[PDB]
Design a protein around this ligand. Sequence first.
Ligand SMILES: [Ca+2]
Length: 1030
Amino acid sequence: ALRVTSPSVEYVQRPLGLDAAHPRLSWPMASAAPGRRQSAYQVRVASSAAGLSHPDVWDSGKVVSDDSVLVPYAGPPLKPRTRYFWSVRVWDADGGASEWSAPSWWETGLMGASQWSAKWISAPAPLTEAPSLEGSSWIWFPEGEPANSAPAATRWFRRTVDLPDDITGATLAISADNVYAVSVDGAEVARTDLEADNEGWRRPAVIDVLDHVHSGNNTLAVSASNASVGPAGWICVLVLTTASGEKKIFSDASWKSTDHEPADGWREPDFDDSGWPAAKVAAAWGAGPWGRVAPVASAANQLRHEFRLPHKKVSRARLYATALGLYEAHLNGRRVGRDQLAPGWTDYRKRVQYQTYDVTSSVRPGANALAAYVAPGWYAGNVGMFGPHQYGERPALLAQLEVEYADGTSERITSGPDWRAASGPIVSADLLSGETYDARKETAGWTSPGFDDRAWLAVRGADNDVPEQIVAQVDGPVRIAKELPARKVTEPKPGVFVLDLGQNMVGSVRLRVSGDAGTTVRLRHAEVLNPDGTIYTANLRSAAATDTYTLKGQGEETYEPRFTFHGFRYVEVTGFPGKPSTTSVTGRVMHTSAPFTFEFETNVPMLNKLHSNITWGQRGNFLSVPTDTPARDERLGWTGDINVFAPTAAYTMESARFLTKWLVDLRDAQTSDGAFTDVAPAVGNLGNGVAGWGDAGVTVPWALYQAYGDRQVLADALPSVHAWLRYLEKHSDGLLRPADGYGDWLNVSDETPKDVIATAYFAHSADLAARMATELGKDAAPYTDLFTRIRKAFQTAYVASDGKVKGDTQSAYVLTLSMNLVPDALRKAAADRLVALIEAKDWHLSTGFLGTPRLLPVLTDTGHTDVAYRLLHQRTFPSWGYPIDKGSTTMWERWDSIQPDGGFQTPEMNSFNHYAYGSVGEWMYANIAGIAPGRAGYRQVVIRPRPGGEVTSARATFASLHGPVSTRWQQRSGGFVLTCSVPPNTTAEVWIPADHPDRVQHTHGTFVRAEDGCAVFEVGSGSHRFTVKL
Ligand SMILES: [Ca+2]
């Protein structure tokens, strides 16, 4: 008989906090007997597992249908905060019913803003703002009008100040147009450098100076330099904290200045400056050309609330939470959940995602404490190459804890004005810069009741814009999926240790260290090494990717960052007490919580490595949004990159929830004139309307539809697709598109004309829109007609009588053949020419981002699988093999990220972890493993392994929505054997290469025809075997 295995709701088993009005149910089935199809199903939903025999929510009754995947709930409207139990049974094609599936459940979340009574809260200004420059003045030497114009020169400044007794803290905030070097009592405490300056006056530094100040007279001295003729000035505040409040010392006319280089000693207390004139105020803070300049603070503050619960039996407790920023919540001394970087990145003006946690076993009778760290994240911290405060200035928390009692009563505890805040140990936390943690600043016991917080500060209501929508998180929360212990420790310079994790990973480390309180360990993170064995970080650009930990002197300390992440294979450790060992550093690999769904293995080590690298490049960049790179100061949701990689991504991980979520981001960013943006979420004024980039709005829904059969993804995308096509028609001339855009980005000196590219993508988008309309039973004629008209305009403009395409590049042919743009009479000629260009390059590809994903497929489509294998197995540059031979463990941004001479490509743009060239994956899975969808969502699977190159042996399992699709084939002593497993309610078309077609032995299925050297079989579900002996 047929049985239901692993039923799911919205792609997952037992989702907690699901807000869908009509959650989509799936029931993979298993059967030892071949050839099974579903004729009917019946779903029941009830308020308890036992209640399913007499269901109180829904009973579909027996529904005549072969649908078994993503069937929408169609009972009475669902209520918020409710657990729904469900079960399904089916009838096979004979009429026999299965067992009822073992009962399962989903639980709704809050389903709408009105169900929140919590308030947004933030730590108060002393905890979320850096010491500021307000009250201070920009000063210079008294020459002319320095705020307008000063010479390109250095000026010198001194001030002796009498500081109060009992100083407990001291900070210096300082900025200069253009650079400065500041000292206290002759010891330099900070500087900026002329060569490194790029409008550094915009970014004041804040420095702790307690170790250099004392009571009584202290001498401050500053040199400052103006880089060119124009505005000059420098500004500072020295804040001294004592138990009786703050004292501030400003830059102002009480400072002495000189314009002639002073004698040495000029920084020392007893130097004679009595002949130096007073410094001149160039502008008060806020005045001059410099505006309201402020230092940036990025602390992850602690927020907490104690409360009393009744002594009654708890039936259930849930915490719903989110942040404008990032948070980690704690309840009664125990961290809540296992998510990292919650709530993730959305356009916070339009939506923020909330999380739901089961905390039933954490709540207590009597005294309870709820607590959270709250950090800047994407909301307020550095984002890409664009700096901080993209959405707001200060992070905010929203939290609602609901406890239900067995007597039917309940309590609700929320974020609000009664919460208290403290700085705690996380001094700085930034996604790009890293995290700085001082264990001495720990407040032991703060996540537990009975804690003394009388000297904590009242929280404030947040002044953040309220997101339009608060929605249950759609994608899998980022979680640690695995740990990578350090594989070796080197010491390439004295006291500078480099630990190799053996894999370029994304996440952060656990540091174990024992040593004296006050010892500071620094951890820098790198993707690659210099030839001397030191870490190379130039390609990271402005992202420091440095975590700093100061010890509390308490046994074997453990430090695990919370509010940052890096992309790296190597960790450089400085300041370690003694010698780190491999146990000192362990990588914690973080990404979206989605399963891997493709196992692939061949007889060829290099292909197995290529597959590993693909899955590592994908997972490294699947953290909240599909990113271009996880390591440098970028990490943006680049449309081009996911456009090319989506079909491969949908083989190797369950990518439906992740890319569904991202397409919501893309549509949130679509411009008012219908242009898809270059990145989504849209930050930093990057462009829009770019061919092969903005087209992700069409190609990514289609890729999800092909992999999963997800009709809802198409329905939700189609109106944005219409608006995109309308935009593209408006921005074209007789349907020909401008030669603008990125083009075939990072091709190997084989540049395709951008108008050929742009017009090809326009047509392809029209083609896909017709295919979507068709799948949805909508009217496709307008789109089909549009496609027809673009293809004609395209062929006339760029395709010659002999089949030559304008630009005569590898990508020019790849794209036209792929998108069905070459007239059919000329496909042979166009493909012949492609092969000719490959042969001419000594059997190397030349394609960039847009050409590469379609190259091996086009080669196979046109009867050149042998050539595809040649490219695939190629080891010399450019190739997939070239980087692998150089020790790659991910896909690089460039074919030559490490060049053949051994040097690096330009650090201006050179990542070792972009998934784009991993798009070769889909060709391997479809052709070596022989697993491809004949109908959307693998309702029919085409099993067409094409042996070739060095592959004589392959095995694969794809975790489809209908269940596992497996293949295993072997060529040996003349003979071929293929076995496969095809799940119930699906069918397969199997192609078996054979000298003599009608001689193939087969356990199941029907010979239908001979084609291209193989017997073609049609087969139903089950375990099949095919053999060809001689
Ligand atoms: Ca200047």
